[model samples]
Target: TSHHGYQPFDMHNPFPAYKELRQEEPVMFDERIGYWVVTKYDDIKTTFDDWETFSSENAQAPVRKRGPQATQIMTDGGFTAYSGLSARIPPEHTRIRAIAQKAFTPRRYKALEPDIRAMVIDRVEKMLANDQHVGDMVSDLAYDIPTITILTLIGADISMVDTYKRWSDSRAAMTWGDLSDEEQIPHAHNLVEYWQECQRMVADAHAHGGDNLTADLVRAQQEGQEITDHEIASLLYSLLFAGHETTTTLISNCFRVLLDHPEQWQAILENPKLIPAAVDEVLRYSGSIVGWRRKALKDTEIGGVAIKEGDGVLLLMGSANRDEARFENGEEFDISRANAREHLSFGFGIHYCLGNMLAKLQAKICLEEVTRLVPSLHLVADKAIGFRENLSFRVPTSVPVTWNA
Candidate 1:
């Protein structure tokens, strides 16, 4: 058994093990994964704050080594992609974020709000219209909503939601999932195809400027911006995956976690204004990403544990968010909790989630429309929800539900 009941890749019910780790070995070196598992709240925040001491270069590296065949395939297919923004450091990160930030504006997100709500209502009504009176929130509501939003923003084909989703699933598995060499082959092919599309989007933008974010970046570059074509394509590579994957999980978990708590669900139904706090609470209680990675730049210690330079540290943000020192009765899911926004679900400091507002906006819109449209929605009784096995992302496979006809 793993130390302190901790299984590095198991996403199902990791809280119990997390509790044990926080109380006992807060900083433990797990040989299985070859990283020091840091579970304390303050320690994680400190690490995220000091990016120079703890680098994010390892954040995007794969959990498992790429096999020979997969390596050859990616290399031959011109797979030179690495980190988009998360893995970059200093001047480059600063410059790119400044430019990308301009394109991802509040004005743009606000403009998209009406359409987002319309899409949510359309999907929920479709699910309710079904004769069975039963539907999966994941497939029926959460699946394509954010994907379509992101595709529209990036000026990609909105009808290619399934295609993008397939590519994203491969990206998650290849990067975070503990897969065998044989299992990595197909995902390798998907990554190649995904990168090609990212490049194509940038090239298309340069050929004929459009109204989307991609064209904005291309135009900025033409008007003396320092970013290169490869950099612009890499940004798309990151945004396309990071843009919607977590938001999809956030939307799914908003229902799964809230509906699991009837009182909370009732509270929202009674006072519709509690929607934002409830959304923040849902993120605090059950965030989409549980663990994230950082590498030590120099010899350092975390939570009184000594570490050497080049050592990998796995910050269990899920555990840190629930640390009793930071959150009172951290295990309970309380929407009224005042400090819910303090959760580390989105890492801290410079590398904090850039699309956080867009994510929360989409989640809030989904919650608002769902509560307004289908207040009677309820999770299927006593049915267990399955989660994907990943090192970082904690994704529910499906959230099955049945409601009043």
Candidate 2:
């Protein structure tokens, strides 16, 4: 159990130890965290692929000790699951996915380019115009742009962007923070408020016949599509949650990796066209999401290790993407790598992130716009970086950067 600490993972830099785990024990039980740890590339993929045996139902870190007040508040909020889109399997998975996929079509996402580009430009230009020519990349830039993009795309009232940002931040902290159940109670109450706000948005969208995603789902519900209230709630939760969360980390992490590996900045500054590929490399090199949670549906064997039924597993996707068996020079960051897209940052199998395309587009647009406007962008020399000590996501608390004025 003490070979390497496992309870709360090392948030700041988990890769070195994860490398040791990849070689020493591909699969081992962490008595500390009370879950089987899966390292190595193929083994992690195998676990993600076999959904029938490795259930995604309630696929989260083990329910931890919580406070009674928070429990009641959360219970009172009442979402059957985070998003039925993520919590269901097979036939049911296909059904809900069909509706959401129908609503979030390729053309609709493609149409979002101008808005994404404009947002990026506005953010970069404001930073450049600042008296100090400095910005906290995480809060000032990463947080709002993606949130605005996602909410606007989904047809929410853009005037309430501040309120949405508060709700989203609260929801993420309550859900993913390292806080005890008691520590989470305050945020949990806030999350319930967020859900209630979403419900109100759905109702307004319905009556006005709005063109956004939430409204489209409501329209489908009213048109006798059999989408239950809870299911709709779940879908909105996913939209509001995953829509911005991953991209926030993706953008922040991309910049961190680039500055950490400063030589690659030229490949990007010299040729803005490479922004998309650089983004892919960033995903491979330091993708925001760390892993997926799954429960063993039956007694199962993964990577020659036995797992009991109902046992929880933390599949290290971040580790897998860097497995030496898969990526040559696995620990090094190289933007021009040929197989960058093959990384599992968006995940694999049925649970792959639906916002993958949108995330890439946002990142691509941000990098291109930033390079064009502030080609000399670099992290502040004297500042220290911090990461949110959450369960799964790996995002900087703030990334202060500055450029020559």
TM-score for all predictions? 0.99, 0.95
* RMSD list, candidates in order: 0.8, 1.8
Assess the local accuracy of residue 16 in candidate 2 as a C-alpha lDDT between 0 and 100: 78
Candidate 1 local lDDT, 119-209, one digit each (tens): 9999998999998898998999889989999999999999899999999999999999999999999999999999999999999999989
Cα lDDT, model 2, residue 398: 81
* Per-residue lDDT over 129-226 for candidate 2, one digit per residue giving the tens place of the 0 to 100 score: 88877887787678888888888877876776677767766666665565776677777777787777667777787679777888888888888886
Report every candidate's CA lDDT. 0.93, 0.79
Candidate 2 TM-score, true structure as reference: 0.95
